[PDB]
């Protein structure tokens, strides 16, 4: 085997990241999603399991789901966002890299069993 590619670079972005979650093989999502208020409605991650479909991508608490597989998760629900999330295996989630991290960061209570 012998083949090298330098590829053509050219990119400049930070916010709004695309994370594709694949529900195949030995790997199942293990992150919790929450529902924002009326002022900040949406789908935000609450927790991420170690070695989950979200952990693999490096998803963290705050990553608000604004889009999923080209879906409008900016006004979805915990049922619609889940149904759509459970709709197919492979889905392209578009987070804003800890969009609403303050929705959780703000004070650290630390629940036991929701």
Swiss-Prot record:
This is Harmonin. Part of the IMAC/intermicrovillar adhesion complex/intermicrovillar tip-link complex composed of ANKS4B, MYO7B, USH1C, CDHR2 and CDHR5. Part of a complex composed of USH1C, USH1G and MYO7A. Interacts with F-actin. Interacts with USH2A. Interacts with SLC4A7. Interacts (via PDZ1 domain) with the C-terminus of USHBP1. Interacts (via N-terminus and PDZ 2 domain) with CDH23. Interacts with USH1G. Interacts with MYO7B. Interacts with CDHR2 and CDHR5; may mediate their interaction with MYO7B at the microvilli tip. Interacts (via PDZ 1 domain) with ANKS4B. Interacts (via PDZ 1 domain) with DOCK4. It is found in: Cytoplasm, Cytosol; Cytoplasm, Cytoskeleton; Cell projection, Microvillus. The modification Phosphoserine is found at residue 26. Residues 18-100 form the PDZ domain. It is linked to Usher syndrome 1C: USH is a genetically heterogeneous condition characterized by the association of retinitis pigmentosa with sensorineural deafness. Age at onset and differences in auditory and vestibular function distinguish Usher syndrome type 1 (USH1), Usher syndrome type 2 (USH2) and Usher syndrome type 3 (USH3). USH1 is characterized by profound congenital sensorineural deafness, absent vestibular function and prepubertal onset of progressive retinitis pigmentosa leading to blindness. Expressed in small intestine, colon, kidney, eye and weakly in pancreas. Expressed also in vestibule of the inner ear. The chain holds residues 201 to 301 of 552 of the full protein. It comes from Homo sapiens. It comes from the Eukaryota. The PDZ 1 domain mediates interaction with ANKS4B, DOCK4, USHBP1, USH1G, SLC4A7. The N-terminal region constitutes an independently folded domain that has structural similarity with the CCM2 C-terminus, despite very low sequence similarity. Anchoring/scaffolding protein that is a part of the functional network formed by USH1C, USH1G, CDH23 and MYO7A that mediates mechanotransduction in cochlear hair cells. Required for normal development and maintenance of cochlear hair cell bundles. As part of the intermicrovillar adhesion complex/IMAC plays a role in brush border differentiation, controlling microvilli organization and length. Probably plays a central regulatory role in the assembly of the complex, recruiting CDHR2, CDHR5 and MYO7B to the microvilli tips.
